[PDB]
């Protein structure tokens, strides 16, 4: 169920790199990719020596349009690229020096060399695209014949030719020999066969190529009747005269009569198809094809408006109904009671069909692949096997499926094309898991689409091309492979075709660069592989996984297939052949190197052994030995996956689940204490226009009394602020008292009673139903009233406390009439007092300030109204009470504010108009009830002992004792981090859519349409012959074909109508056998180390060794075994937005607990602020903390498992665990603050992810004032291991405590979390000129350095960051996917704290949207395209060619720029590339460590080219309609999964809104139904 | 797949009739020259509620024989054809073609 991975698109590139090579491939995408990346690899040498990479083709110079070659090169070959246009004047100034790759004609490059401005010494790589064409051959004939072989071989640029698959050509084979020989002679390269054809030829078992002859058809009465009526129909149809001048005869339709089609062409095709199916397959197949043609023709009736077409198509449908009638009557003629319709098909079938049935019956796991050239034959064949399997119990175990080549044109019928593509994907899915063993294909399944390993390929039609024949041959991949071709006097023609095609296989497979192990060599390998013991890392275990010689190459192949990669990164082992002559015996030696994505970059050296396969097996054996020696392969020999990887245990204990955890868990669901004064001084009054009340402004500083705080603990100093009441902005200061007040118990009782009276009856901030007890262990804070001393100070107003104690039950009561008769009036009593009414609302009174005394107003004065003439009449009518003394002036009152919060720091003074002047929800009701103006009478109102000015000082204290009960946990967190830290002291839109669609469709065009033109030239061209003559090798063809003929008639291809010392001695022919007997002794095997000792003795006894080079084995090894080759084949920066401004850990007071309490207050309570400001940065810290640490602990471990480790440590479950072990859970507030229910004056259910929403936010709490570094120590308080550990004892340094030192244990151990160690350079030095090669790789990168604004101190991380995953030549370092891995988190902080610290102060949702829009792979791709970083990077992957080609077609048609991803923005936020996105991110890793962990350097360098587009995103911030719909119901409105209906054509989507219901919408597709559900939810809700 | 059902529907609706002249047409050897085909086919047209259209083609054969196609307006429709140097003989040939064609659909 598996397959051995071979080196496809790897041996082609290696052979194209080493020697002069010619590659013949089917797709034009893969040839252009191999040419492109060969130009990329050779540009490394072209850069230093001042040379020119060239591309010669014929598509160049055709139009001013950028052709596919130019656009693919100016995107992927991250180089400077130029292409000739047909009509330019060719500027000679710098176009060949300031461009790495130039695309010229053969004539253009010939004339460029003729002018001698560019020399042949100044060009590195020649690549000739499609040189097998005879026109291209005659073009390049003078170019080679006058310049190239006259040039010396030291002056020769490396030559790669590209060709079409010329093996498929229908010429004679001597012409093919002349082709190969003459093209090798002219173009001076070895032809490497280099295709899918030859990897499936070599690396899969070649099938027995069978001819099955079939007899001619016999006829019966039904057959001549059907043929007679169809021959009559052809007689009428060819008899029918067609003329537009006869049917219509109009002279004004001269251009329109040509466009009217011929109504006989489709009848000719249909009944010709039925005639040939009658001729070759049978009346059953003909009746089925006639039924199919009726199904086509009845719709074809519907399509046409013409009349003669309609009657002719009705005539053809009439003929099809005739054929159905005759055939169905004849099948029902034999359909008796119990008669077998299987035999009814059997008698009427042609011998071709019965011979196919014999081929099927010879195969009693199956995987049968049957081809044909017509789709209707495929369909009727599928129905034959279906009807046979439903009738024959012998073939009942067969499941079959057919597939046609009817990719429709998307420009005409896109929906039917989508249906055919969905059907194709579905049947390929149903085939590839071996559900149905029999598939019937067409020409579209020969190339492009791959199939799994088959065991039988049957060709109904003998093809005219060898590419179809050998692709059918290759599709049988499994070891019992059988390539059956059916034919029905044509045996001699098929024998000649088989001999010709096996001849092509002979002069193509042997004309390779790798070749096969022969069968006798395979048997030699079988007898040789038993000479060595199995290498076992656990040899003591009997059932241990073992590596022998033979299975070692399969294990190395599996290990190379198991490294993490995408679809287009393809990694394979690379073994190179070397022959060594030893004692006259030729013993081949095999070197082996693993890819760079594996850290074993050094070559692994085998020993010379006399045969090829045994030496390859030794190379794989020593490779597995070195693999388990380093540690990439485990003891079970399974290569390491992402899930099975385990890191070091000092970083693994954080992933252990908690005992409570181990809605799913972790998911989204008498003492002289301190005294202070609260001094308030007005600094900015309310404006006169804002004062709608029209009253006097009351400052708090004219009041003789104020408030003070009495605390047992020391109050730290805080920043100054203000309070913004109706009176205006009042600066608040906390004045420190100069003297300490002793306490007395009776005064304590009086103070507590005053606090109860203030919090229950004055301010009502302690609401009822709960209990009070003024003795708490957690703090002892009291609030006292003071009066300003005449000396300037403030002293405690004990008299006010006594008055409040004596007036603790002050309620408005009914004053009697005699007392109101005896009551006088005092304006000083009613100057700045508080009045309550007692005529109404006795249980719940309302309190009013005194504003104005009006002597002109009286009870005798007019009430504002006509229903009540006077105030006295108003009172006696509405309440029935009599005012006694009416000569006194009335009273103007001011209502209290209906809003308690007044600080919300520094934004209440502009928020006073936000909600109507403290929102006044009772004002409208009381002004309706009491007729607007609240003019009161002072005798009928009561006076409170609380002054109105002291009341205005007292209303600006909303959060009082729940504040104090909350703001001690934050200071305790502060104390813990200051204990373990050192810092801190312990004590239109439719037009836009249509333009986007037209630009996308007209701009793709370099996609599967190129695959369809490959499908067009698949079975059509096979062209471009050059020359053939009378050479004697022609006779060498004629006999051998006859010899091949004698193979086919004799090999079963045509079927008619019917002593261990001896193998050790052969194992080492150059080594004496007595030494082998000494090493063996009692044992029975030779170990590998014995062979190392023998070869070491041979090198010691014979110090002169030799080497030779062949094979497809790469020179990508080099260096470790080559280049030197000196006799060794045995063994081895403003302060604004400043990240780096870490404040000093010595002498700092530490964080204020207000920020920590902000981290303890959530968005669920939403009391002015929320945690989502901090946690939005905090989550992005954890990655930047963990990944960079994981860059330094596992430097020689690749990123594919460090990603799993980071996803385990950054996970929400991990942060749930890490926050729970600190037990922070009673520390957040997740309940709404409201004193009636959930406040105890001196619990909260919290979701899982919300705990994490605190914890990351906690590091946000230490972001600014602590800097980054001590913030790292806070996860040292967490246990998130980010900083390295040094274990010491008590140093006793009296200068200062160590920043990051912990508390000592019982063994007095002292842990120091020191600095981050600077990383080692990734530049490995297996070669002594890795610095020289690193200098030799990157010439032009100084332009890259001036483009950014950064100059590198080191090109090591830059050269790694500029290097693809599958870039095996750059053997010094690893690939750019380790500097993607930490550079993304570093730039993620740079963007994130850029987006958090700016003074615009975005919302949490706005910050989340600005992060998810400003961070994606597409934006880094956009700045890679725009600012010219399609100029430096290195790459080695196949279909990245066409992908990134069409990508800069999109960009350059738009003009690079932004707008496509600026639409993708909310078109997908609500992946065409990867690499060139992460390329711009990869440098963000390198400058992270070239600048030695300097975030400010990276942001300063990238700011000058980032600034206008982040300004544009700062213009696109202010909210969104989708963001509207997600601020009403973010979680509440959930769109459910779609459900199919009973009709099977409709889809219903239901959206549920909590406490509102479920709303369902139906539609033809999923998106329309979801839109209908959303509109139904909007109609019910909005 | 709806046209497979249309083929079966046409076969059933032209094998469901129980006219005497259809049974005679199936019984009589239609290669006999004594049978009128034009008048019998017009009678069959009036019996089976359809309409025979003698669309006489203006283009004759290359050998010089006048051509005419008949249309039997059934559900689904049928078209037959014939040729002959004069109009009457060609129409007789076309009617004989359509009558033997109906002899196919009246075969059980």
mmCIF file of N, CA and C in Angstrom, chain A residues 66-115:
data_model
loop_
_atom_site.group_PDB
_atom_site.id
_atom_site.type_symbol
_atom_site.label_atom_id
_atom_site.label_comp_id
_atom_site.label_asym_id
_atom_site.label_seq_id
_atom_site.Cartn_x
_atom_site.Cartn_y
_atom_site.Cartn_z
ATOM 1 N N UNK A 66 4.400 40.738 -22.112
ATOM 2 C CA UNK A 66 5.340 39.865 -21.407
ATOM 3 C C UNK A 66 4.910 38.413 -21.535
ATOM 4 N N UNK A 67 5.726 37.636 -22.245
ATOM 5 C CA UNK A 67 5.443 36.218 -22.416
ATOM 6 C C UNK A 67 5.721 35.481 -21.113
ATOM 7 N N UNK A 68 5.366 34.190 -21.087
ATOM 8 C CA UNK A 68 5.382 33.403 -19.854
ATOM 9 C C UNK A 68 6.778 33.313 -19.254
ATOM 10 N N UNK A 69 7.798 33.267 -20.117
ATOM 11 C CA UNK A 69 9.186 33.126 -19.681
ATOM 12 C C UNK A 69 9.645 34.366 -18.911
ATOM 13 N N UNK A 70 9.323 35.563 -19.419
ATOM 14 C CA UNK A 70 9.756 36.793 -18.760
ATOM 15 C C UNK A 70 9.068 36.992 -17.423
ATOM 16 N N UNK A 71 7.760 36.754 -17.369
ATOM 17 C CA UNK A 71 7.032 36.984 -16.130
ATOM 18 C C UNK A 71 7.379 35.936 -15.071
ATOM 19 N N UNK A 72 7.601 34.676 -15.477
ATOM 20 C CA UNK A 72 8.032 33.678 -14.502
ATOM 21 C C UNK A 72 9.434 34.003 -14.003
ATOM 22 N N UNK A 73 10.289 34.540 -14.875
ATOM 23 C CA UNK A 73 11.638 34.824 -14.420
ATOM 24 C C UNK A 73 11.679 36.063 -13.529
ATOM 25 N N UNK A 74 10.850 37.073 -13.816
ATOM 26 C CA UNK A 74 10.890 38.277 -12.990
ATOM 27 C C UNK A 74 10.123 38.091 -11.690
ATOM 28 N N UNK A 75 9.371 36.996 -11.536
ATOM 29 C CA UNK A 75 8.955 36.667 -10.176
ATOM 30 C C UNK A 75 9.884 35.685 -9.475
ATOM 31 N N UNK A 76 9.983 34.443 -9.964
ATOM 32 C CA UNK A 76 10.665 33.437 -9.152
ATOM 33 C C UNK A 76 12.169 33.582 -9.180
ATOM 34 N N UNK A 77 12.787 33.683 -10.370
ATOM 35 C CA UNK A 77 14.233 33.885 -10.340
ATOM 36 C C UNK A 77 14.459 35.273 -9.807
ATOM 37 N N UNK A 78 14.630 35.278 -8.501
ATOM 38 C CA UNK A 78 14.754 36.441 -7.672
ATOM 39 C C UNK A 78 16.125 36.974 -8.042
ATOM 40 N N UNK A 79 16.132 37.737 -9.134
ATOM 41 C CA UNK A 79 17.288 38.149 -9.909
ATOM 42 C C UNK A 79 16.821 39.304 -10.777
ATOM 43 N N UNK A 80 17.752 39.894 -11.516
ATOM 44 C CA UNK A 80 17.383 40.948 -12.451
ATOM 45 C C UNK A 80 17.198 40.357 -13.844
ATOM 46 N N UNK A 81 16.013 40.562 -14.418
ATOM 47 C CA UNK A 81 15.525 39.793 -15.558
ATOM 48 C C UNK A 81 15.194 40.741 -16.702
ATOM 49 N N UNK A 82 15.658 40.418 -17.913
ATOM 50 C CA UNK A 82 15.230 41.194 -19.070
ATOM 51 C C UNK A 82 14.857 40.276 -20.229
ATOM 52 N N UNK A 83 13.862 40.701 -21.014
ATOM 53 C CA UNK A 83 13.401 39.981 -22.196
ATOM 54 C C UNK A 83 13.351 40.921 -23.392
ATOM 55 N N UNK A 84 13.893 40.460 -24.519
ATOM 56 C CA UNK A 84 13.823 41.183 -25.776
ATOM 57 C C UNK A 84 12.383 41.259 -26.288
ATOM 58 N N UNK A 85 12.003 42.445 -26.746
ATOM 59 C CA UNK A 85 10.775 42.675 -27.487
ATOM 60 C C UNK A 85 11.105 42.687 -28.975
ATOM 61 N N UNK A 86 10.122 42.420 -29.854
ATOM 62 C CA UNK A 86 10.429 42.355 -31.300
ATOM 63 C C UNK A 86 10.956 43.641 -31.926
ATOM 64 N N UNK A 87 10.594 44.805 -31.390
ATOM 65 C CA UNK A 87 10.895 46.070 -32.047
ATOM 66 C C UNK A 87 11.707 47.037 -31.191
ATOM 67 N N UNK A 88 12.469 46.555 -30.209
ATOM 68 C CA UNK A 88 13.353 47.470 -29.496
ATOM 69 C C UNK A 88 14.645 47.655 -30.278
ATOM 70 N N UNK A 89 15.392 48.699 -29.928
ATOM 71 C CA UNK A 89 16.660 48.995 -30.578
ATOM 72 C C UNK A 89 17.849 48.356 -29.873
ATOM 73 N N UNK A 90 17.597 47.524 -28.860
ATOM 74 C CA UNK A 90 18.586 46.786 -28.063
ATOM 75 C C UNK A 90 19.666 47.701 -27.487
ATOM 76 N N UNK A 91 19.386 48.453 -26.415
ATOM 77 C CA UNK A 91 20.437 49.259 -25.765
ATOM 78 C C UNK A 91 21.584 48.399 -25.250
ATOM 79 N N UNK A 92 22.802 48.767 -25.650
ATOM 80 C CA UNK A 92 23.991 47.988 -25.324
ATOM 81 C C UNK A 92 24.666 48.441 -24.037
ATOM 82 N N UNK A 93 24.106 49.435 -23.342
ATOM 83 C CA UNK A 93 24.771 50.089 -22.217
ATOM 84 C C UNK A 93 25.020 49.177 -21.017
ATOM 85 N N UNK A 94 23.960 48.712 -20.356
ATOM 86 C CA UNK A 94 24.120 47.867 -19.181
ATOM 87 C C UNK A 94 23.080 46.762 -19.073
ATOM 88 N N UNK A 95 22.381 46.418 -20.158
ATOM 89 C CA UNK A 95 21.301 45.441 -20.076
ATOM 90 C C UNK A 95 21.806 44.018 -19.874
ATOM 91 N N UNK A 96 23.088 43.762 -20.116
ATOM 92 C CA UNK A 96 23.651 42.444 -19.865
ATOM 93 C C UNK A 96 24.509 42.400 -18.609
ATOM 94 N N UNK A 97 24.774 43.545 -17.992
ATOM 95 C CA UNK A 97 25.467 43.600 -16.715
ATOM 96 C C UNK A 97 24.546 43.899 -15.545
ATOM 97 N N UNK A 98 23.497 44.693 -15.752
ATOM 98 C CA UNK A 98 22.513 44.977 -14.719
ATOM 99 C C UNK A 98 21.315 44.043 -14.789
ATOM 100 N N UNK A 99 21.415 42.951 -15.544
ATOM 101 C CA UNK A 99 20.386 41.919 -15.545
ATOM 102 C C UNK A 99 21.059 40.561 -15.453
ATOM 103 N N UNK A 100 20.639 39.766 -14.465
ATOM 104 C CA UNK A 100 21.222 38.445 -14.263
ATOM 105 C C UNK A 100 20.849 37.492 -15.387
ATOM 106 N N UNK A 101 19.569 37.430 -15.740
ATOM 107 C CA UNK A 101 19.095 36.534 -16.785
ATOM 108 C C UNK A 101 18.543 37.372 -17.927
ATOM 109 N N UNK A 102 19.070 37.141 -19.124
ATOM 110 C CA UNK A 102 18.578 37.774 -20.338
ATOM 111 C C UNK A 102 17.962 36.700 -21.221
ATOM 112 N N UNK A 103 16.787 36.991 -21.764
ATOM 113 C CA UNK A 103 16.081 36.053 -22.625
ATOM 114 C C UNK A 103 16.201 36.573 -24.050
ATOM 115 N N UNK A 104 16.972 35.877 -24.875
ATOM 116 C CA UNK A 104 17.232 36.326 -26.231
ATOM 117 C C UNK A 104 16.845 35.254 -27.235
ATOM 118 N N UNK A 105 16.727 35.673 -28.488
ATOM 119 C CA UNK A 105 16.600 34.728 -29.577
ATOM 120 C C UNK A 105 17.950 34.057 -29.818
ATOM 121 N N UNK A 106 17.963 32.897 -30.480
ATOM 122 C CA UNK A 106 19.238 32.401 -31.025
ATOM 123 C C UNK A 106 19.879 33.372 -32.005
ATOM 124 N N UNK A 107 19.070 34.034 -32.838
ATOM 125 C CA UNK A 107 19.597 35.060 -33.733
ATOM 126 C C UNK A 107 20.037 36.296 -32.959
ATOM 127 N N UNK A 108 19.275 36.676 -31.929
ATOM 128 C CA UNK A 108 19.639 37.839 -31.133
ATOM 129 C C UNK A 108 20.917 37.633 -30.343
ATOM 130 N N UNK A 109 21.061 36.457 -29.726
ATOM 131 C CA UNK A 109 22.289 36.145 -29.002
ATOM 132 C C UNK A 109 23.458 35.949 -29.959
ATOM 133 N N UNK A 110 23.184 35.436 -31.164
ATOM 134 C CA UNK A 110 24.221 35.303 -32.185
ATOM 135 C C UNK A 110 24.741 36.668 -32.628
ATOM 136 N N UNK A 111 23.834 37.624 -32.854
ATOM 137 C CA UNK A 111 24.265 38.962 -33.247
ATOM 138 C C UNK A 111 24.886 39.718 -32.079
ATOM 139 N N UNK A 112 24.485 39.395 -30.846
ATOM 140 C CA UNK A 112 25.124 39.990 -29.677
ATOM 141 C C UNK A 112 26.558 39.494 -29.523
ATOM 142 N N UNK A 113 26.789 38.203 -29.775
ATOM 143 C CA UNK A 113 28.151 37.680 -29.757
ATOM 144 C C UNK A 113 28.960 38.164 -30.955
ATOM 145 N N UNK A 114 28.295 38.472 -32.074
ATOM 146 C CA UNK A 114 29.012 38.943 -33.257
ATOM 147 C C UNK A 114 29.535 40.362 -33.070
ATOM 148 N N UNK A 115 28.859 41.166 -32.246
ATOM 149 C CA UNK A 115 29.332 42.519 -31.974
ATOM 150 C C UNK A 115 30.469 42.555 -30.961
#
